[PDB]
Write a protein that binds this DNA or RNA. Structure first.
Length: 51
DNA sequence: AGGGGGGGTCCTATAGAACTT
DNA sequence: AGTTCTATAGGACCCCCCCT
């Protein structure tokens, strides 16, 4: 895609951050990733990588 | 028309795998 | 090293707030 897929770490952060109720926008800033990936992934982290 | 904050959409090249030399 | 492939990351464009 336009960028690399999410690393286990990145996705790991994302999981915690969500737990912390961080905002999408802050999340991106935090790990320098588009809201887009972040969004999609959190909507279903499992399904990520299933293609 | 900016900076900051929150949230969408959705086009579109390309990551990265599978393959072929 | 090149090919060929397509689901997907980027980020464009949108909505709404308030302000050194």
């Amino acid at each position: 895609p336009r960028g690399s897929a999410l690393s286990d770490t990145e996705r790991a952060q994302l999981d915690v951050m969500k737990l912390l109720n961080v905002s999408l926008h802050e999340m991106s800033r935090k790990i320098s990733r588009s809201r887009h990936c972040i969004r999609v992934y959190l909507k279903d982290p499992v399904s990520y990588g299933t293609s």
